[PDB]
Design a protein around this ligand. Sequence first.
Ligand code: ATP
Ligand code: ADP
Lengths: 188, 472, 239, 505, 168, 50
Amino acid sequence: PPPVRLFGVEGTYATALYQAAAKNSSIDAAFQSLQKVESTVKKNPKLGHLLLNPALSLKDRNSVIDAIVETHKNLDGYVVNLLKVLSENNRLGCFEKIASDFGVLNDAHNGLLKGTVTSAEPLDPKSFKRIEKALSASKLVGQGKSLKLENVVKPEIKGGLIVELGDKTVDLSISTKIQKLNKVLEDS
Amino acid sequence: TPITGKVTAVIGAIVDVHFEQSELPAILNALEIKTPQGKLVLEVAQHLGENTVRTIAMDGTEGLVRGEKVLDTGGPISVPVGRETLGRIINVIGEPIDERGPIKSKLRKPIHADPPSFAEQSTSAEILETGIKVVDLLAPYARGGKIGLFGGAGVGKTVFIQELINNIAKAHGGFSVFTGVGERTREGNDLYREMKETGVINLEGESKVALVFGQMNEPPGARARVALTGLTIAEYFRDEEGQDVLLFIDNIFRFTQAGSEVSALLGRIPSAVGYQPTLATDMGLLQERITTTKKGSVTSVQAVYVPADDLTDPAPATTFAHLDATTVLSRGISELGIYPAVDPLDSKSRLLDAAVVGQEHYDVASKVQETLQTYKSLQDIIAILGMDELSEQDKLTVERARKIQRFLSQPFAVAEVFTGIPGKLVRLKDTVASFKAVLEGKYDNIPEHAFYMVGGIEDVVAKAEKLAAEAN
Amino acid sequence: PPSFAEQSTSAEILETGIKVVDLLAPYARGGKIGLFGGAGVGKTVFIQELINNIAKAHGGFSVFTGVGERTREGNDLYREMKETGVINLEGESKVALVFGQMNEPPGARARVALTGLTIAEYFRDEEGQDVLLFIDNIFRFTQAGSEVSALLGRIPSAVGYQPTLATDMGLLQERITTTKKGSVTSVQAVYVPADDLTDPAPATTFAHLDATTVLSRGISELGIYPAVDPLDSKSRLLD
Amino acid sequence: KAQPTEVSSILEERIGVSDEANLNETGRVLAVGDGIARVFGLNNIQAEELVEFSSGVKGMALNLEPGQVGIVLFGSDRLVKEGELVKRTGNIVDVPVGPGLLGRVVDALGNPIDGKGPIDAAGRSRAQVKAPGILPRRSVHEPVQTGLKAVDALVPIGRGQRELIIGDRQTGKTAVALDTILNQKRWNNGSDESKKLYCVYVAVGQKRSTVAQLVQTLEQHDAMKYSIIVAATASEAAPLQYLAPFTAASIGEWFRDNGKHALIVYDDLSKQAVAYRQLSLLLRRPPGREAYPGDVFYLHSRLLERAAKLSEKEGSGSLTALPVIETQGGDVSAYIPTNVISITDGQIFLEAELFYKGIRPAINVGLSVSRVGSAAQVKALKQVAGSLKLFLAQYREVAAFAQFGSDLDASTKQTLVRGERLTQLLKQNQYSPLATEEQVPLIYAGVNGHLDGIELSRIGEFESSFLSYLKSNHNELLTEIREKGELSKELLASLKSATESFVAT
Amino acid sequence: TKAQPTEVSSILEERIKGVSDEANLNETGRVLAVGDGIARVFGLNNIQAEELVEFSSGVKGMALNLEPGQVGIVLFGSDRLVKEGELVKRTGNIVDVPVGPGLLGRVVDALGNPIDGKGPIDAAGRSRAQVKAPGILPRRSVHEPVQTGLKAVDALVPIGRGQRELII
Amino acid sequence: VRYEASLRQLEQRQLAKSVISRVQSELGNPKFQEKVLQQSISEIEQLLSK
Ligand SMILES: Nc1ncnc2c1ncn2[C@@H]1O[C@H](COP(=O)(O)OP(=O)(O)OP(=O)(O)O)[C@@H](O)[C@H]1O
Ligand SMILES: Nc1ncnc2c1ncn2[C@@H]1O[C@H](COP(=O)(O)OP(=O)(O)O)[C@@H](O)[C@H]1O
């Protein structure tokens, strides 16, 4: 019984890392180790990201893994061997993707159903809050699970708002309605 | 226990089933999925790893959702067999689509069985007289052998098969299986009309034929297995009953084409021309189950479509290796109104030996092929210069050969609606003596047109009398 | 392209001015014309005479489009068109020129035709005229489209042409039509590739040409101006 | 007026859908190049489901993958942009069907392009419907009177008999089915629906001007009240041209399953094969012979199998199909036609040289044949044309034989003269269909050698002269042929006298 | 760049554990991908090129392509009885055949198995499949004829004991 | 009747450029501001349906 699929390409490292780690939980600890190692990649951005290049070596890649485990107890559990394999497999560059994806799987386990409330201009907090609770208590979320929510600014839309989550959306905005306004009048 | 699978990929008639249970069903087993249209059948093609297989559809795959529940049936597609299947119109799955109730058989055997081994082989020289002139002269048909109808687009193949069935299947005594593979639905309906009206199908009484169909409308995975369905039914009566089984296949090229269309979607590198790499192997596994054992006798006739009249296509060239008696239909011979349009040269037989057909038959056919080869050699000089620039021996030979060509054509009872002419069931020995007297030139006085579309040599005499009394 | 409702439902005859064209292979007002024949037969003289005959007769203008035109020959063409007066450098030149030269990447040469198309579409749909689009060569345009599809890594189709060949043609043809505002009549030269008519590029072009015009050598051999073969130049509107 | 704003504002009320606009489909577009688009998400999408992009262009999701789904476009990719929102319809691709489709001119999706407002549809029907099985069929037994001379003489057509019209470029192909539709005006003006026969013309990949003139011409002769035009012109996308004949086939199935009789005309399947190989090569699928994917036989197969004669259990509906194949230089051995010949129930070959000789229709009788047409020929025509095909093949035998200038006997020269008269007989101008009662006496004169003394050039005026002669005088015999469709011996002798009367001039 | 071939979910999982099971498989291998008589089999580091192998079903196969991830093995029977992850035993043999005098009259397969049903096969030795052709020095120019019995064959294109001759 | 249908089509295209005029009327509004609350109450209505 796997979680929500990462669907093949290069999430399969993260997929195997989860489903082999999770057989004995520790995925919060493995998760925090992943957060910490992506942090120390980010905390040393010069040649933490600039040294995920493929043209180095096998040996020097393994030594960069040694520098990662050299930084205190940055790695913990399977995630070093993960890197041992990753280093050997030289898929280190697509490591950022793995991180974010494990985060998605993890907060799916928590049930944070990330949403969005697209607009062409940011809005007041009262609207945020009222919408937030709306979806939260809506059949969408079955409760027992959270509900983030992000307003974004979109100029490509002419205003209004659109709610999004669980590949399920509602647009009541302006742009689409103008469109429907032009379509209906486009007949004889 | 149900081994539940999940739909992960849908590409045409090729679908991918993931499992979480590690007990994956083996190759060539039958999966099924409850559709709102009922059920749908899949066949296990290949383990792709990751507890996930790739399968071929037996039906159109429209309106399917990734993650739909997939149910396993354990084994391959078992087909009902036996005398219950007589006179029943059976789907590739094994569904009676005559709506005359379910086929209440005893046994349902899976289609993917092994071919008979080398020790189980049996040889025979039992010449089948067909009544057809060019067959009984130039390429005799072996009872228990395999018979090919190599033909281009619509040059009389299905008509020739119906002529063979009308000539043979009543005077057969054993049983018969027709299998319409990729053909016209109207052709299958009209054949069913005939089988009722000939009484070969007796609807309330007992029939002797079994109908396995599935036509060019059907998706290719259905077309890739219907031949195996009719095959399993035929070899059951060959083995369980030990009878004489007439297996009529139309069209065997549609099978290899169904093997071609999915192979690009089955992840294979495309092979030669556009066909699949597993051409000769699948052709072999199909043909080697079509044989005559010590237990029973299978006389099979298979139409072969030729793509765009290219005999160097790999599919009919592969098919030549599996056949005992070739019969090739040219469009150009049909354009001379010569029906049937059998090429007199290119037809062959493992039969036609002087110690088999008789010495005189062999000699007559030898001289006929020599004469027609001489004519075909002189054809280009005829095209440029004409018959005037010949030598007189060559001119006499061309005259006699062109008499022979019109004499080859034979009126069909099946194609009577194209002719208005009654069919001619011409006996063998009369045909031999007829071609004997023609090679002897006893009728060189008779013009060429009196040879056209005729029965025996007595009918040539009658038609020459009619032309003498009418053209005057 | 203009909609199906905007199609003028009956092609009248574009009166050119030339006796043989108006007699034997009449041109549709807003139609397609396959001009054959190599150079040296006064083909440029023929098309300049067409320019002047449209300018005097109907008053619509001409847009010439050299896709893959030889730059030396484009220069000689431009110099002649100055000298024959259809281009007046100070007064009213009666024609607009677009020359996609041969030394331009195939991305240019698969768009030079659409440039000249849009220019002609303006003078149709703004001025309400009958504007003549002259294209050489449609076959070099087909080569350009096939090379563009090749460089994009698309699998090539038949003959080595692009797989989008019918669509790449139809995006050019159906933007050339007779509106109710006016029409764009297009004359375009056709090189027959290696003298074959089952070649899909002339077999595609012939699925759009309503009228043909053949500049034979034998007619020019007899000192006849123009060099029109009477027998081969045929129309679908000779009815 | 404002009544369009009234109707559009009622449609604005529908635009009620926003109050229940919780689509379980929306997903981002991964990539979209070369007439295709990979879309992430859509985890409850169906196979061959219609979707619609955010730029209004619809599409069919054709191949499903773990991770994405490849959706073909139904238009130019210039409108679709990467990263957008792809709502699914919830439906396998369906088209409007119904009686109000008559007269209208639509796209591949039933969206009308005539500018005549919406479509009175009686329902929606899937595109890839299964062809009916062998049991709800019947062998054809009802004629299709095309109005042409040699067509109705030599190659009769049953209601549902799948007959190919094959020819070359600009060879009078379109005019054949056009005048067939124009002949159907006789019974579409009538009242018996089983006598009626409804016409669907499918112009794909062609010029919009050509289709406009065709629709114009069908309005001039007033065929439009029973006509349905499906336009898939060359400017439009290749999947539209791929898709449209299936939609028109669903329309023909709507008419057939109502018990009615209907005619569909495909023009042409050749460009549909071009569009389909354009799709498959942009699907990166390997081609086969002549760069076509190997399923292109299955394509036109699965198209044309949805056209037959229903049995009385189904209400005796029928659907007759007229495909058109443009070949290359009279070739009948290219990969595309040899497939179609293996599907259809017969051929109508148009020789380029006969039309080059102006013989319109340019029918090569020696190649053109039908298989089961004789079972549903008009019984009078079946009586009077038995020797006719035999005599024309006979004249064809002495056609190439007489080119050497050698003199011959009176028998073969007799066949030569009478076959010249029959050859110059069967010409027929466009938009000039002939009823069966009109076609019978010309055949009866042509068989019995009466044309032989008439000049070869005089035959064309002789035809109209003898027709106006009979319509003036032996109008009772015309009604007898109309009512019976079968000539008795008394009708035969009265016909003989009525012929030989005007044969005296 | 592109998904590699040793990246399936059932194989990386074990490598994450630190069990390192890929080194244990030297004389055996698991079936990753069986299909079309073709077995991508993981393991078998001590396999040889053109080596006969056996499956747990009982069908035998040949290793041809030695990819660093897995072994390509073609099959001398149907893949009807082979599943994913089935145990793969290494035979230890380059593909050899029994040879000897008692083969005369008998009818066998490629592998010397008597398909004639006349009992088993009395061999003398066993020989490799891809035996190297003889060199230049241990050769004789062909002079001993071959009696074909055909007229124009013996007359025009005579056959000697040692040459090769194509019937095309 | 031909000119009647022509006048209907001219009326329709003049109302199409009037649709352009209506869009330009709709563009400069604090309906841009107010209509956010429209979406607010709306999405409340849609998600409270389930
Ligand atoms: N009976 C006839 N009377 C008058 N003209 C005819 C007749 N038959 C054919 N034609 C002429 O043949 C020409 C071609 O017509 P049609 O479009 O049917 O040919 P086609 O081969 O279908 O061409 P395309 O395939 O490009 O449509 C027309 O210009 C028409 O005038
Ligand atoms: N004896 C005959 N006389 C005249 N025509 C014939 C005869 N036999 C067959 N034909 C022609 O051959 C065609 C049958 O094509 P066929 O090859 O049977 O179809 P398929 O390709 O489906 O097998 C018919 O059109 C028919 O006219």
